Amino acid sequence: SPIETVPVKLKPGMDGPKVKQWPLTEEKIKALVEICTEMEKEGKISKIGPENPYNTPVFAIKKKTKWRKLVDFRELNKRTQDFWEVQLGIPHPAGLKKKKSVTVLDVGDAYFSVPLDEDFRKYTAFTIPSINNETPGIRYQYNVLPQGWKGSPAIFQSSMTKILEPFRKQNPDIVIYQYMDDLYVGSDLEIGQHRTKIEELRQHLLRWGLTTPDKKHQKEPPFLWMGYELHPDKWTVQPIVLPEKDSWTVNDIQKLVGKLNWASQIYPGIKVRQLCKLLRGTKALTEVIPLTEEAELELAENREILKEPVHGVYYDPSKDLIAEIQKQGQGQWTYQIYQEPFKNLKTGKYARMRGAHTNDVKQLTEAVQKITTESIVIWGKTPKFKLPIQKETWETWWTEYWQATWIPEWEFVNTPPLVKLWYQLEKEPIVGAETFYVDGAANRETKLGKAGYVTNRGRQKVVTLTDTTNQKTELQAIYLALQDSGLEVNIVTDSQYALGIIQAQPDQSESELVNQIIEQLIKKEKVYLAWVPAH
Amino acid sequence: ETVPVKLKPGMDGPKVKQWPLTEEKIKALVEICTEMEKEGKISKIGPENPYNTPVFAIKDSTKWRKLVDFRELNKRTQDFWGIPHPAGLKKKKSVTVLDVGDAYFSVPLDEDFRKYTAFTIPSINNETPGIRYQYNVLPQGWKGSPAIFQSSMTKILEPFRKQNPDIVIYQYMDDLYVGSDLEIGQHRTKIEELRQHLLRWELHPDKWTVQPIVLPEKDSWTVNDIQKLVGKLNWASQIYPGIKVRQLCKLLRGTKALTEVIPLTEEAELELAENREILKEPVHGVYYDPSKDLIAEIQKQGQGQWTYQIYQEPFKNLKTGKYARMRGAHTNDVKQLTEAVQKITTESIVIWGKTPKFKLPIQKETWETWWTEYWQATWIPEWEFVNTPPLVKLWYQLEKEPIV
Numbered sequence: 061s062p063i064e065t066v067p068v069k070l071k072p073g074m075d076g077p078k079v080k081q082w083p084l085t086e087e088k089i090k091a092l093v094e095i096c097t098e099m100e101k102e103g104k105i106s107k108i109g110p111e112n113p114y115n116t117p118v119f120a121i122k123k124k125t126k127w128r129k130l131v132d133f134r135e136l137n138k139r140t141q142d143f144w145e146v147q148l149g150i151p152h153p154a155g156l157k158k159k160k161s162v163t164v165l166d167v168g169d170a171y172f173s174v175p176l177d178e179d180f181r182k183y184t185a186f187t188i189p190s191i192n193n194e195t196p197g198i199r200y201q202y203n204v205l206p207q208g209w210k211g212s213p214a215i216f217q218s219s220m221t222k223i224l225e226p227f228r229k230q231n232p233d234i235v236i237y238q239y240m241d242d243l244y245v246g247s248d249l250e251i252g253q254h255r256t257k258i259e260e261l262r263q264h265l266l267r268w269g270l271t272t273p274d275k276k277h278q279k280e281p282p283f284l285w286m287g288y289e290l291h292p293d294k295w296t297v298q299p300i301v302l303p304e305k306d307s308w309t310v311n312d313i314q315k316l317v318g319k320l321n322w323a324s325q326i327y328p329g330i331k332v333r334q335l336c337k338l339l340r341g342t343k344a345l346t347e348v349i350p351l352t353e354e355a356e357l358e359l360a361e362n363r364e365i366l367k368e369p370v371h372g373v374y375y376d377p378s379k380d381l382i383a384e385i386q387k388q389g390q391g392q393w394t395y396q397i398y399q400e401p402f403k404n405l406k407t408g409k410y411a412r413m414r415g416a417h418t419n420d421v422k423q424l425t426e427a428v429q430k431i432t433t434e435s436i437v438i439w440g441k442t443p444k445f446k447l448p449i450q451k452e453t454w455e456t457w458w459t460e461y462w463q464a465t466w467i468p469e470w471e472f473v474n475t476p477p478l479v480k481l482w483y484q485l486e487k488e489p490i491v492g493a494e495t496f497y498v499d500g501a502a503n504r505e506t507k508l509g510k511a512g513y514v515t516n517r518g519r520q521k522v523v524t525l526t527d528t529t530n531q532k533t534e535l536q537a538i539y540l541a542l543q544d545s546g547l548e549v550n551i552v553t554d555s556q557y558a559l560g561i562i563q564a565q566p567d568q569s570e571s572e573l574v575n576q577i578i579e580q581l582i583k584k585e586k587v588y589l590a591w592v593p594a595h
Numbered sequence: 596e597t598v599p600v601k602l603k604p605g606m607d608g609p610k611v612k613q614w615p616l617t618e619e620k621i622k623a624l625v626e627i628c629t630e631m632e633k634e635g636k637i638s639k640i641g642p643e644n645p646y647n648t649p650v651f652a653i654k655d656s657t658k659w660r661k662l663v664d665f666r667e668l669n670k671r672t673q674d675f676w677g678i679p680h681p682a683g684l685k686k687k688k689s690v691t692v693l694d695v696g697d698a699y700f701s702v703p704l705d706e707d708f709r710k711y712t713a714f715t716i717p718s719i720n721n722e723t724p725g726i727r728y729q730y731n732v733l734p735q736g737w738k739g740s741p742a743i744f745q746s747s748m749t750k751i752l753e754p755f756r757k758q759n760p761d762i763v764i765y766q767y768m769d770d771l772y773v774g775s776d777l778e779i780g781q782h783r784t785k786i787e788e789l790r791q792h793l794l795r796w797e798l799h800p801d802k803w804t805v806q807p808i809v810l811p812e813k814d815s816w817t818v819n820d821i822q823k824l825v826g827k828l829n830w831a832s833q834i835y836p837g838i839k840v841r842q843l844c845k846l847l848r849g850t851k852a853l854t855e856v857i858p859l860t861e862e863a864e865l866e867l868a869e870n871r872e873i874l875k876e877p878v879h880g881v882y883y884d885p886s887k888d889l890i891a892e893i894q895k896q897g898q899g900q901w902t903y904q905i906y907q908e909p910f911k912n913l914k915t916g917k918y919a920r921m922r923g924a925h926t927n928d929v930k931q932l933t934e935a936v937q938k939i940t941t942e943s944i945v946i947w948g949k950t951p952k953f954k955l956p957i958q959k960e961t962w963e964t965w966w967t968e969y970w971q972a973t974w975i976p977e978w979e980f981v982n983t984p985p986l987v988k989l990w991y992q993l994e995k996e997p998i999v
């Protein structure tokens with residue numbers, strides 16, 4: 061090829077590889093000899109000699125049955141400089157525009173079609189062994205991008221970009237996507253028009269040394285892309301298959317849970333509670349755990365759900381972008397982004413984020429932000445939101461929370477259950493309501509404590525606890541206060557953590573205790589918590 | 596010509612990842628870049644360049660402006676030991692800021708340093724390779740820039756500094772703060788006089804009052820009232836050790852209704868008066884240390900209100916203040932915040948000539964997803980995300996506000 065090479069250097073003052081050539085048989089050698097004489101002429105490699113101290117181990121494998129070759133650059137690579145990341149962020153189906161026609165050119169010997177930085181070449185040197193360590197073996201080096209070498213992919217795609225700059229400009233109404241060795245080409249032109257242009261493109265590549273065929277290996281829609289089958293008009297989800305057996309190992313159960321978990325995003329209703337259950341106290345990946353009835357059941361409900369065809373639409377820039385969210389239980393949320401009703405671009409759910417202590421509004425908030433970021437990426441725009449929370453709820457919460465928070469343009473949609481505040485600590489002491497002066501004290505070392513209260517009304521109590529901690533007592537104090545009082549209470553404490561609840565008013569925590577206190581808080585009609593300095 | 600700039604001993608170029616940008620943000624950046632490309636200020640680069648710095652587009656204007664986050668690069672850029680801070684800037688009736696950022700494109704950047712200025716324009720849904728470029732000229736947002744361009748800068752300025760020696764001119768990054776005691780008209784007429792001058796190639800510091808802490812007063816006090824008072828004062832004692840809550844805390848002996856009224860003993864009443872006296876002025880012995888990081892903490896007070904303190908040592912504040920949302924930010928915390936951050940940082944610059952390190956009462960994800968949409972300053976301070984201690988807020992919420 062006549063494409064300008066990319067200047068490549070080795071990592072900080074290191075040196076090219078000098079690993080010794082693995083010994084092979086007269087058979088594997090004669091093969092590598094054959095292959096290499098070809099590459100030698102195709103221009104991919106060059107016979108070198110004793111001027112070179114570098115070397116990489118060449119191997120000989122038969123694929124599915126002619127003798128092929130494999131060079132191991134593990135070393136060369138770990139010595140090769142760093143390059144700017146290669147597409148780690150790939151497109152996501154729901155971000156594609158629909159097209160009249162879409163073609164996928166399979167750029168052949170991509171790598172070996174691009175010139176290697178002549179300077180660097182020397183390091184790629186390798187050697188074909190002699191019949192059981194005889195006289196010197198055959199010596200070569202690469203003159204093009206080597207299959208398996210660190211800098212290749214990164215260098216190849218650039219080359220592909222430089223080479224498409226003209227055509228692209230010249231064909232605005234034509235959109236290409238480079239990925240690995242494939243070129244995805246779509247357009248809204250007429251099928252013949254398309255065909256013509258494709259061929260014009262195809263030829264354009266050749267003008268630089270890019271073989272890309274047609275006729276034999278030629279790919280044909282739909283197109284497989286990370287779990288989806290893509291059609292120009294729409295996309296559909298690769299139907300997922302759950303094997304039926306009478307012997308399930310741990311390995312089996314985890315991988316299964318894995319595939320199910322992936323299915324949860326697209327498919328509605330997938331559950332694995334009982335499946336996960338089977339992993340409890342497993343002693344070995346190969347262990348055979350019998351599925352309980354419950355497991356055998358859901359495993360069955362999932363097989364049925366997964367035999368449903370989930371198809372989708374592509375992004376239309378001229379239509380609104382909408383996202384609706386559902387709170388499927390505590391800490392679990394489902395969302396689906398669409399433009400025209402029921403024709404979803406994408407869907408998905410967020411696992412029950414078991415935090416130390418939050419509330420549903422906050423959690424709703426987070427789901428909103430995760431989505432927003434996703435969208436910004438997929439569509440470079442953010443959706444108008446449809447949220448199961450009254451605008452009044454929102455306003456009340458947010459406008460008083462100690463932490464900065466927000467929700468882009470959104471609208472209420474009443475699709476129960478709605479998210480709400482489970483309680484609200486009073487703003488001012490409750491006149492009338494009983495006042496409980498609480499206190500918990502525990503020996504952190506002996507883990508022995510007590511907790512109790514004394515109300516202005518004369519009521520009192522104390523409890524002794526074993527295997528506890530100070531914070532726990534403090535909380536248990538508050539717990540009993542809530543337990544023993546009417547629907548309206550005043551509780552004063554010197555607990556710094558209670559000062560936290562006051563500021564965040566959490567409706568879920570990591571601690572069962574805090575949890576319990578919550579359940580109580582939720583139960584009173586009015587509660588006013590007051591913190592006072594200890595001692 | 597080009598001066599040989601380098602990185603601090605053994606430091607490597609940034610390699611920060613580009614954050615996702617909006618469609619409108621990208622479209623403008625591409626436009627902006629193709630021009631600069633043509634104009635020779637920047638040049639596309641290869642994959643052999645592994646560095647990267649974030650970029651984004653900001654807007655007072657409606658044309659979009661390009662903004663690069665050189666925070667990492669700057670920190671790694673060698674030092675040049677610029678302009679000593681003019682203690683007088685703070686004492687001016689009115690200051691105006693100007694963006695002399697455009698002046699740098701003029702000077703070339705040491706060829707061997709360019710690679711480190713690499714930045715990338717993303718593509719929606721990653722359907723296109725990012726557009727890699729690197730600088731050929733002095734980059735806006737880089738520290739090395741105002742420096743290298745100092746000689747040229749001062750040079751051009753003198754003629755004005757002399758025609759107007761009552762005016763103060765300070766340069767931070769791409770900005771220029773002009774401070775004079777003239778009256779609004781005569782001031783802004785004199786600034787435009789300065790703009791004009793610059794082209795051929797509204798703060799009010801003296802009003803920033805130090806605000807005190809006012810303790811509530813009442814006809815009658817309740818168990819709760821006193822309790823709240825004691826809590827604040829006790830905390831507050833971490834600043835003024837003279838503050839005392841012994842007499843008061845005595846009134847708190849007994850299991851009585853929070854709502855009950857307690858009569859204040861004269862002992863207690865003195866104690867309170869004694870405390871009001873203490874809080875009547877900033878704590879002594881607090882001085883700014885130039886060889887110490889400047890810190891700014893912010894608390895969300897609610898109803899659109901925010902409080903802050905700029906200090907270097909815990910409880911030894913250099914300045915404290917409040918911030919009320921600006922018309923329009925009504926339903927957006929993030930806007931108020933970024934707006935707030937920008938404000939404080941300018942005062943910071945204006946006073947000590949350096950940006951503080953922030954502690955923001957917001958979650959990292961939330962901030963990072965939206966702060967850019969409301970950013971307007973050419974610079975970008977450093978920040979950390981925190982949880983506001985319930986008391987720190989309560990104390991400063993107590994600050995004094997005008998009569999009317």
Ligand SMILES: CC(C)c1c(OC#CC2CC2)c2cc(F)ccc2[nH]c1=O
Pocket residue numbers: 151152153156157158159162235236237244245246283285290291292293374722
């Ligand atoms: C040119 C690119 C961005 C493009 C497509 O190529 C592609 C691709 C990678 C799989 C994502 C594409 C492919 C389809 F199968 C359907 C719609 C499409 N719409 C498009 O705009």
